[PDB]
């Protein structure tokens, strides 16, 4: 209250106010990198250069990537499935291990058809049935 309490004969108050200049936390040595990553295929890449929010990679290159919608619909020679039409690789990059010749066969729908058989066909127990023993 600004009105202020009436002063007694022995007014004790206890000062709790402290002045001083606030501190400043250190600056992380930032490193900017500039290169054609998306080739023109990302949320921040498809936008005009006047407004491209720079990333940070707080987490890692695995998640800062998935943050960007990096997909691609490029054609490729077909050697799986029936009917015409060249194989159309179409899936968005999540991690950096996506270019691994393995995560590809898991992503591309057509190739996965052959990998699906290798789970069932190759798992034929011709060792449990052949091993009859009376």
């Amino acid at each position: 209250a600004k009105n202020k309490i009436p002063n007694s004969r022995l007014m004790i108050n206890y000062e709790t106010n402290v002045d001083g200049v606030l501190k400043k936390k250190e600056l992380p040595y930032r490193v900017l990198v500039v290169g054609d990553l998306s080739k023109g295929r990302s949320v921040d890449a498809k936008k005009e250069f006047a407004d491209r929010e720079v990333r940070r990679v707080n987490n890692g290159v695995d998640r800062v990537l998935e943050e960007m919608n990096i997909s691609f619909d490029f054609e490729a020679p077909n050697f799986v499935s029936k009917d015409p039409s060249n194989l159309k690789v179409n899936y968005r990059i999540e991690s950096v291990k996506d270019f691994r010749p393995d995560a590809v066969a898991k992503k591309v729908p057509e190739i996965r058809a052959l990998l699906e058989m290798k789970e069932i066909l190759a798992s034929f127990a011709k060792d449990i049935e052949n091993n009859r023993n009376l």
Binding site: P6, L10, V18, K23
Partner: protein
């Protein structure tokens, strides 16, 4: 089959609202006045929160005319034969509302002057969560308060009066629900009643604010010691032995229920102390607790100059402002006797110092209790007469309390350079 009725009849009003509202508001009253010490006379004042909400909100800018202020300051503390109060206890739960924020701003306006640290509790509605147990999910409350939802609150933490408010988190279970095999109702000498159940499951069967045990330790830290160093930590103050836990047989084999509302982890104990809150952390299974932090709602700041940074760290600390307050209860209380006696600048510095001198040391005594007798480390008392008014003076004391432990980092390493006689070249 008459038992089937009673197990329905009585269980209809024990579960009823209003009825169990008085329970909560009396069980936690009994909890405070359970110890009964040699020279610690408690006292009651049953008032609705609204009857004070209207009070301060009407007299925030004229506190001296506040009705409550006229029943604690000018009534018992100010008056001659009156016995002053010490450490008020708010049995309420305060949210982040812009109304309940004034309630503290007012009560603190009183406490600040009456010199009586106002301890209270904060609702789970503060952290913006409907279940207090789900506060554990929040990483750091330090980053939480940066959210613009707490703007009004951060302003209050900057006020001087906030250095007397001390808000507690967590609520202890104050009553065990009624089972026949567990906590049987003490029937009569013929009226079979012990076979009597209640109805609860998850988390909704009576609670009480941690503030009680907090104050109920300040009392303890007075009958035993004399000052308020003995209200922190395990080995020293806040331990709170033997709490009302709970057990229940759903399908397993009597799965115990922790006495505390929330099972604070380690960095929770700390990450709350910075927000200006008092966590009532539990030891898992031990059915006990302890107050590690006892900080006011005052902002801690940081500052560049080391001294300034340390100032703000001690002022935020509630346990000291409890002690420094006890000096005010000495000045405006005892020196009143020699109000007309002829005294000097060199005489008042005698009476006031000769007293406090028995409570200042540098040497450490074995055990915490034997040393907590001495709160302060050293004190200055430079009084001096002022011009104009001949019989008037103006004192200015300054106390450095025994700084408590608060934590530490540690880097272990295999040096292999300490004893070169074993790894050195010359051999």
């Amino acid at each position: 089959v008459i038992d089937k009725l009673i197990d329905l009849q009585v269980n209809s009003i024990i579960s009823n609202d209003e009825f169990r509202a008085l329970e909560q508001e009396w069980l936690k009253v009994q909890e405070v006045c359970q110890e009964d010490y040699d020279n610690v006379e408690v006292s009651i004042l049953d008032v609705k929160k609204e009857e004070l909400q209207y009070d301060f909100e009407r007299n925030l800018y004229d506190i001296s005319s506040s009705d409550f202020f006229k029943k604690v300051y000018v009534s018992e503390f100010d008056q001659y034969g009156g016995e002053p109060y010490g450490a008020i206890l708010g049995l309420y739960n305060f949210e982040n509302t812009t109304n309940d924020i004034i309630w503290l701003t007012g009560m603190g306006m009183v406490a600040k002057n009456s010199h009586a640290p106002f301890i209270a509790s904060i609702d789970k509605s503060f952290f913006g969560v409907k279940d207090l147990s789900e506060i554990t999910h929040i990483k750091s409350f330090e980053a939480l308060l940066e959210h613009p939802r707490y703007k009004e609150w951060n302003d209050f933490r900057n006020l001087d009066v906030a250095a007397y408010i001390g808000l507690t988190v967590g609520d202890f279970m104050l009553r065990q629900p009624y089972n026949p095999e567990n906590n049987p109702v003490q029937y009569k000498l013929m009226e079979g009643f012990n076979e009597f159940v209640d109805y609860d499951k998850n988390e909704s069967y009576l609670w009480g604010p941690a503030s009680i045990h907090l104050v109920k330790n300040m009392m303890r830290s007075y009958d035993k010691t004399r000052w308020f160093q003995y209200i922190r930590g395990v080995e020293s103050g806040g331990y709170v032995k033997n709490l009302v836990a709970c057990v229940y047989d759903n399908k397993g084999i009597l799965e115990t229920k922790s006495p505390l509302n929330v099972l604070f982890a380690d960095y929770m104990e700390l990450s709350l102390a910075n927000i200006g809150l008092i966590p009532f952390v539990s030891e898992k299974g031990t059915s006990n607790a302890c107050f590690f932090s006892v900080n006011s709602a005052k902002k801690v700041e940081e500052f560049v100059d080391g001294f300034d940074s340390a100032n703000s760290r001690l002022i935020a600390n509630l346990s000291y402002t409890m002690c420094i307050s006890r000096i005010s209860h000495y000045i405006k209380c005892v020196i009143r006797d020699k109000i007309g006696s002829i005294v000097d600048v060199e005489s008042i510095q005698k009476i006031l110092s000769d007293w406090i001198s028995e409570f200042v040391t540098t040497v450490y005594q074995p055990t915490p209790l034997e040393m907590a007798r001495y709160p302060f480390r050293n004190v200055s008392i430079e009084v001096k007469t002022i011009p104009g008014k001949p019989g008037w003076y103006s004192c200015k004391i300054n106390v450095i309390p025994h700084i408590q432990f608060e934590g530490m980092n540690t880097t272990m390493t295999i040096d292999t350079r300490l004893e070169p006689e074993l790894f050195g070249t010359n051999n």
